[PDB]
Amino acid sequence: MHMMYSKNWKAKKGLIRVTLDLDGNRIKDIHISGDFFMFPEDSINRLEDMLRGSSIEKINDIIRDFYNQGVITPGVEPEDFIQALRVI
Template sequence: MRKVGEHKARKGLIRFEIDEERGIARSVKISGDFFIYPEEAVEELEKSLEGREISKLEDAIDEFFKVNFEGEMPYITVEDFKIALKNALRGEKNDEA
């Protein structure tokens, strides 16, 4: 089941698309019009979330930014990513891929 959600941060939109199967995030796509440097950090975050239990994704976001991220995110915060995630998990948009 595809879950989609967005959050309008102070300076940018963050969108999560999660393909979930049996409580596991099989694929995660993060997009939007926010700025993050280095740009590869978004892809690294996506990969760090894939294969994890849906219920543990919020903790995984915290872990990623505490351990793996050394960069800049002007006008957006870790909390903004977590809000977009929560909106996706609540949204449950049934776009069967």
């Protein structure tokens, strides 16, 4: 199917908003926004570029990878972008 959703997620400090555009099992587009800190700041663009377009199955692979390049996201754990980005 073609599917598009929007999701909020309260972390310990902050709120991750996600919008995903899904073509079957595959990520056509993604936009991540909201109330948080992330250094470097343009790492947010890397995280969107990485997810576009992988498979909604191998999301965690992408999250954990991303973080292992050394990204600092105060009060927002890596399993917070998992809850934010998860549909089912």
